[PDB]
Each structure stands twice: as C-alpha cells, then as structure tokens.
C-alpha cells in the first residue's frame, strides 16, 4: 500500500473531465483568491461540514444554494477582473 | 587636588581615565561621590501593570496571595508597583504568563508618560529591543491605532514578538529596519518614540563594560549616530494632525555629547521644532552651557534623571513639536 501521489499515475478521462493537464514540476502554477463575502460563505460551509449533513432537506438545499450563490458571485468578480485586465 | 582625585577615583572604582574625567566634570565634588555610589549599586526592581488584562490593585492582591512583597511606588505612577521580596520567581507566576504584568525599569516608564498617546493614533518606536515601551504605549491607546515596532537586530526581535504577543497587543507590526532609513519607508506619523543606542553610562549596573570599554573614538561615532537617528524623527512626523503629535527623545546616558548636544543640533538644523514642558512630574533642568558652547534656552524645559537623587537609571527626556 502506497500513496497515490507518489505513484506517477496518468490522469483518466472519466465522467469528470480531465481538462488541460499541467505538467508535473515544470512550470506548475496555482491560483490566488481571498474575497470578503465568498469567504463569509466558506464560514457558512465549514460548520455545515463540521456539524454534518442536515436531516432537513429544505435547510440542506438552502445552504447548498448559498454556496452556489457564493460561487456565482466569485465567478462574476473573476470576469469583472478579466474585463478590467483587458481594459488595462 | 583634582589630579589626585582622578587617579584615586579611577583606582578604587575601576573606571577608565577618560570617562571618570568626563563624569567628574559635570558634578560638584561631593555630588560626584554620591553619584558613584549609586550607579555602581544595583537598582530596585519595578513592575508595570498591564492595564488591558488587570489593574493595579487586583494584581497587587494576587501577587501577595502568591507571597510577593509589593509596594505601590510613588505618586508619579498609577501603573508602577515596586517589589521587595518574592518566594516564587517573578516570571513563574501565572499572572506573568498571561501578561498581567511585565518586568521593567523605572527609566522605561517615563518616556511613555512623556508621550501622551491617544486612541486611533499612528505611533512608532525606532528601538524597542526589550519591548517594554511598546507594550506601555499600547496600554494607553486601549488596543487601538497602530505601532510600528522597529529594531535593527533579529535576535532582539524574538524577545519583542514573545513579549508583545504575551501581553495581548494585537496592534503592533515589527520591522527589522535601520531607523535612519525609516522616514523614506513610510513617514507621516503622529507620536514617534526614539530610545537611541547610547553610551550606557546611565546604567552601569546592567552593563558594567562601560567602566573601561568606552574611549575617545566611541564618544564621536555614537553621538554622531544619534543625530541621523534624531533628524529622522522630525522628518517622519506630521506637521499637522487631527490630534497633535509629538516626538520624544530618550537616552540611557548621562554624557553631555550624547545628551543636550544632539537636541541642540536638531533644533538648529530644523527650525520647525519647538520644545515645551515635558509633563514628567519631577526632574532636573538641562544645562544651557557646558564647555564654552551655548545651547538655546529651550533646554531648561528638558528633564534629566540621576541615580543619586532617584533610584532610577541615568536618563534624558525631551519632547518635540512639529510645525511645518
């Protein structure tokens, strides 16, 4: 038994797509984000992770939609930053 | 005669021939002898009460409850508490570990009350090596504003960060910068504070190397460095503010090249500085002339502190105002 990260396993094209695979070690990059209101929803997400899944289907769907609205807000800020970079 | 007095004093106290001659000059003869007793003699141990987590009376009751013999010291301080005897070590008490009180000296108290730090005010400290002054200033603004802690040595910075975060300060940033370069970095503060590197004649009990290891060459470069240190203090403060901001000049030396000469050089080079009454309760006025050279009569408002009069270390305090 060994860790999968240590094994050089190629990425497989499942129902979840591979996207564009980045080379390992050679110019591997990452991203950057802090936020104010979306990170407030990450607070709302983590007690929901800590206190477990909600037995109420209404409250579980309501808290998932709040994270969806946070992703929609975070995405709209990202295209706004892309438009600002195109203007500059 | 005087020459017999210098040779006898250097032999029995072990001073260097130079620094004994300089210190003999600034005193009357019987006053010099009483001063040489005290500065070699160890000083009393003093405690600063953290106003944030505790206050004077309930901390005092707590330490006597742990066996510590205390006494409120003076009418000068509502914050100071002298110690006389302690079964438990002072750093061992759980009040210390929470940051209810901090070890200081008396001379670390008075620059902070020379300053008058108010809430929501941007302040500074060019040398905060033990960190007692910085924790005292934050006790007065009640956890508001911002303090820029500065010290040019990383080794002292570890004790700074340890002392600050124990005391619960939450508002200080500490940078390892030469403070000559500091107004180029930011500038525009309210109340700047400077405890310059000095010759250390004011305190020989803590550092007994100044008895001999301080000569003619050291008395030129060291006051030279206070000048570039001190001119940076005006060039970093604000000429105007919603709450008026003042500089404070504090040195741990009794020398006359280190003290009352640097402030003469500063007030001559920058005419947009005045000096008024410094707010400390007691003290002795500075000398307007020492060796044929005249200083402006604003130095009568400066306060000098001496081991023989008060059981404190040798100190100079002066506060500045910025105009333009």
């Amino acid at each position: 038994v060994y860790s999968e990260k240590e094994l050089g396993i190629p990425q497989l094209n499942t129902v979840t797509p591979v996207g564009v695979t980045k080379p390992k070690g050679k110019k591997k990059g990452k991203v950057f984000v802090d936020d104010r209101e979306s990170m407030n929803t990450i607070l709302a997400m983590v007690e929901a992770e800590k206190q477990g899944q909600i037995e109420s289907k209404i409250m579980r769907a309501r808290q998932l939609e709040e994270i969806r609205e946070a992703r929609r807000i975070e995405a709209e800020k990202k295209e706004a930053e892309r438009k600002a970079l195109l203007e500059n | 005669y005087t020459n017999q007095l210098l040779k006898d004093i250097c032999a029995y106290y072990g001073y260097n021939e130079y620094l004994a001659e300089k210190l003999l000059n600034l005193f009357p003869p019987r006053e010099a002898f009483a001063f040489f007793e005290a500065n070699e003699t160890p000083r009393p141990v003093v405690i600063r009460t953290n106003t944030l987590r505790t206050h004077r009376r309930d901390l005092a009751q707590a330490l006597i409850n742990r066996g510590v013999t205390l006494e409120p010291v003076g009418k000068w301080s509502k914050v100071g508490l002298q110690v006389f005897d302690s079964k438990v070590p002072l750093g061992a008490t759980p009040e210390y570990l929470a940051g209810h009180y901090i070890l200081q000296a008396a001379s670390s108290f008075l620059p902070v009350m020379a300053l008058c730090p108010q809430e929501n005010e941007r302040c500074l400290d060019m040398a905060a090596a033990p960190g007692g002054k910085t924790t005292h200033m934050a006790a007065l603004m009640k956890n508001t504003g911002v303090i820029f802690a500065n010290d040019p040595s990383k080794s002292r910075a570890k004790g700074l960060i340890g002392n600050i975060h124990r005391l619960g300060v939450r508002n200080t940033i500490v940078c390892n910068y030469d403070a000559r370069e500091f107004p180029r970095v930011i500038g525009g503060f309210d109340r700047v504070l400077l405890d310059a590197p000095c010759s250390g004649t004011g305190v020989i009990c803590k550092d007994p190397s100044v008895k001999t290891n301080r000569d003619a060459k050291d008395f030129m470069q060291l006051p030279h460095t206070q000048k570039q240190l001190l001119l940076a203090a005006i060039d970093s403060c604000n000429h105007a503010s919603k709450t008026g901001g003042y500089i404070v000049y504090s040195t741990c030396s009794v020398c006359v090249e280190e003290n009352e000469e640097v402030v003469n050089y500063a007030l001559s080079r920058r005419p947009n500085v005045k000096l008024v009454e410094t707010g400390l309760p007691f003290g002795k006025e500075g000398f307007t002339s020492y060796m044929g050279k005249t200083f402006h009569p604003s130095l009568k408002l400066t306060r000098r502190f001496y081991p023989h009069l008060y059981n404190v270390d040798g100190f100079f305090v002066a506060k500045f105002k910025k105009i333009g």
Partner: protein, 188 residues
C-alpha cells in the same frame, strides 16, 4: 409556553446537582451546568421581554416563572455547595444582565430580583465590585451585550449605571433595596 418549559427544566437540573449524594457524586459523575448557564444567559433577554412572568413546599412544580427565575438565579450565583467558589466573569455578566432585567420587569418580580442581588454582593463583594468603580475597570475591548457565551461578554469594561435608572423607578419600594444594595456594598 417554551419560556416556562425551559424554566420548568431549569430548576429541575439545578435540583439534581443540589442532591447531597449527587454533589458527593461530583467526583462520581460529571454533572456540569456550564452548558446550561449559557442557555439562561442567552435567554435572559427573551425572559425580560415576556410579561407573562406572573400567573395564577415544592421545588419544581411552581407555576410562575418569576420564582422559577429566582430559584434559577439563586442556584447560579449562590450555590449551596461551594458558595464562594464561583468564576468571576460569570459574576460580572449575570449581574450586568440583572441590571438589564431590572429595566424590563414588573414590580413584584423586581424586588425579589433586587432582594436577591444584595445577597450576591454581600457574599462575593470585591470580585464583582470592580464593575461599579471605574478605576477598577479593565480596558481590553469594548463590551458586547449580545454574546453566545457568558465569558464572551467582557463586563469588566462597562460600569453599572442602571442603579441610577432604578432611582427613577418607584422610590417607596424599589429604592429601598437600592440603598440596601449600596449600603452593603460600602460595608464591604
């Protein structure tokens, strides 16, 4: 309803700890109320808002929530066992909220709330007297009246001024207990 049912459950769990064999079972069980005082602290606002406090040898089955609040608030700040072993922030916060209870309460519940809190000060004294005096005030951070925990609020920063508001309350009855509160305070 829910305010009463919690208060019926309130003096209940305080009675189980009040058991002599059960206090001898403090070292034979964890029976701890630090979850439950925090429930009373966050509900002291809601209990103050409800004017249903007075309605038409028993420990639990008393109907009115005025005496239920008393037997609660007696057991919190004056335990039978370990009477003088009480945490300080619990004394500072519950007495400060008692001043808020002294604002929104009817008259009969007021005197007994008043008549309780000299007994709190007369037994504790200097541990709570830091609040009434501003030289004994800690300056850590501003006061947060709506906190989820008793230690979350920091009542050592705020002094007490609602005693002044109770002089403005009917003098003949309420003001008597106020002087009795301040006289026992000076007598300490």
């Amino acid at each position: 309803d829910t305010s009463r049912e919690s208060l019926l459950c309130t003096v209940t769990a305080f009675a189980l700890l009040e058991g002599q064999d059960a206090h001898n079972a403090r070292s034979d069980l964890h029976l701890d109320l630090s979850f439950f005082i925090t429930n009373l602290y966050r509900s002291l606002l809601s209990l103050s808002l409800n004017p249903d406090l007075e309605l038409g040898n028993n420990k639990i089955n008393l109907q009115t929530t005025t005496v239920l609040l008393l037997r609660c608030l007696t057991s919190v700040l004056l335990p039978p066992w370990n009477i003088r072993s009480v945490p300080p922030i619990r004394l500072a916060a519950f007495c400060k909220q008692l001043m808020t209870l002294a604002l929104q309460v009817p008259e009969k519940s007021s005197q007994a709330i008043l008549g309780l809190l000299q007994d709190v000060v007369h037994t504790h004294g200097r541990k709570v007297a830091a609040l009434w005096n501003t030289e004994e005030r800690k300056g850590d951070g501003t006061y947060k009246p709506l906190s989820e925990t008793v230690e979350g609020s920091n009542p050592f920063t705020t002094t007490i001024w609602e005693g002044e508001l109770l002089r403005k309350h009917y003098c003949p009855k309420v003001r008597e207990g106020l002087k009795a509160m301040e006289k026992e305070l000076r007598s300490i």
